[PDB]
Write a protein that binds this ligand. Structure first.
Ligand code: HEM
Length: 407
């Protein structure tokens, strides 16, 4: 077959599921770069993809994503016991108390930023979320962050994902941001180890600075920096989900009211935002041994991508995936493979996102504030999602006017 790289990049989120619908199947062979690639979709495909006797991550991730979004030497590129030991370091951060502490810090930062928004008149809501998220997570993770630096660091953390998926001086800026963010996190780690930074023992930076690997060795400072940024970066990009919360409240009738009255509704709602809206298109692995599945050949070494967006919109699983309907999660069986916006499978024994609790907690705070505390006008604007952009967003970035909170 031909190389479909251009077609994918023109439709990164929907390419796979459209070809699956066209072929009446959940898998197809294709090609991106020099690489034959099996593309998969749906709960069944997700279950094999997360079987680690048949898939590994080492070497799988395109280097372009390494030197921007992910960094080099972090948990995403690990397999086996080496992975699980490193993954444990992330999971230990995520106690209900710690998750709640970050949500509280984030609410404080949101509230502290509003006067700035009021004084502005008009704001692009999306642009405005990165700094409070940055301030919150840094303080939570034991990372010192002077007031006059916060905005710059927010910009750098943002550029790791919002500039990592573009052409022009945009990809250049993303690689530089990665270099700056890496060097910065590395000085944080070194300062903790030398005793000149007094991060608390319950904080991420502390846990990462002091982590011992399966040989009782500290992480090398660069690897520690990369793992710290694996906490800071994705937290700041909860800005994407928070923007979709405001979008849903604006475009889907009944949601605002349901959210005001019905006390149990916030949970269903945040879940449905994660299910409905695009975030990460897909995840990549490599076949670790020969096997066949559903008539498809998976030879050892075959690059394999699992469509997250398509799996979340699978009609087999959700009778009407095209609808925004929080209520659907009343019937959900908490299956770990049929609902995968932040990965599937087991958190400890695979690469499933450790940040889910944080994401949920912060999304709940957003919904609360947008609905119960913060009032704003929404002018005529293009709110349609740009599906040709990574990350996909409302084209306007969600514009707000006359924003206030103290009335
Ligand atoms: C903001 C929305 C977020 C989305 C859409 C998201 C999505 C994901 C996805 C799809 C994966 C990979 C699953 C796989 O490879 O099978 C992942 C991995 C990971 N995420 Fe999340 N994430 C989000 C926020 C977070 C947050 C808040 C953290 C906080 C620490 C986080 C930390 C990680 C880490 C460390 C990994 C690698 C885990 C491993 O390889 O075992 N991300 N993210």
């Amino acid at each position: 077959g031909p190389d479909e790289t251009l077609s994918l990049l023109a439709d990164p989120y929907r390419f796979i599921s459209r070809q699956c619908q066209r072929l009446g199947a959940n898998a197809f062979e294709s090609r991106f770069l020099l690489k034959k690639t099996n593309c998969l979709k749906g709960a069944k495909a997700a279950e094999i993809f997360y079987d680690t006797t048949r898939f590994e991550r080492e070497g799988a991730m395109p280097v372009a994503i390494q030197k921007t979004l992910l960094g080099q030497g972090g948990v995403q590129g690990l397999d086996g016991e080496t992975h699980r030991h490193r993954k444990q370091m992330f999971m230990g951060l995520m106690t209900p108390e710690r998750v709640r502490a970050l949500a509280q810090l984030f609410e404080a930062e949101w509230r502290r930023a509003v006067p700035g928004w009021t004084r502005k008149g008009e704001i692009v809501f999306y642009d405005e979320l990165h700094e409070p998220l940055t301030r919150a997570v840094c303080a939570w993770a034991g990372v010192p962050l002077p007031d006059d630096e916060a905005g710059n660091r927010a910009g750098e953390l943002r550029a790791l994902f919002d500039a990592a998926g573009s052409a022009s001086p945009r990809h250049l800026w993303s690689r530089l941001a990665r270099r700056r963010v890496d060097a910065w996190a590395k000085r944080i780690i070194e300062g903790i180890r030398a005793g000149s930074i007094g991060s608390g023992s319950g904080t991420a930076a502390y846990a990462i600075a002091w982590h011992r690997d399966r040989h009782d060795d500290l992480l090398s400072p660069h690897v520690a920096a990369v793992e710290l940024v694996n906490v800071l970066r994705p937290t700041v990009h909860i800005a994407v989900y928070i923007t979709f919360v405001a979008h849903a409240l604006q475009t889907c009738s009944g949601i605002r009211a349901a959210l005001v009255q019905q006390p149990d509704y916030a949970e269903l709602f945040v879940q449905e935002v994660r299910r409905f809206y695009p975030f990460f298109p897909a995840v990549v692995a490599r076949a670790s041994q020969d096997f066949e599945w559903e008539g498809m050949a998976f030879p050892e070494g075959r690059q394999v991508v699992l469509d997250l967006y398509g799996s979340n919109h699978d009609a087999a699983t959700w009778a009407d995936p095209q609808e925004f309907r929080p209520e659907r999660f009343r019937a959900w069986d908490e299956d770990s493979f049929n609902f995968i916006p932040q990965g599937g499978g087991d958190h400890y024994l695979g690469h499933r996102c450790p940040g889910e609790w944080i994401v949920l907690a912060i999304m709940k705070v957003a919904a609360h504030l947008l609905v119960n505390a913060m009032r704003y006008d929404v002018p005529d604007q293009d709110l349609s999602i740009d599906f040709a952009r990574l990350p996909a967003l409302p084209k306007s970035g969600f514009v707000m006017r006359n924003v206030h909170i103290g009335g």
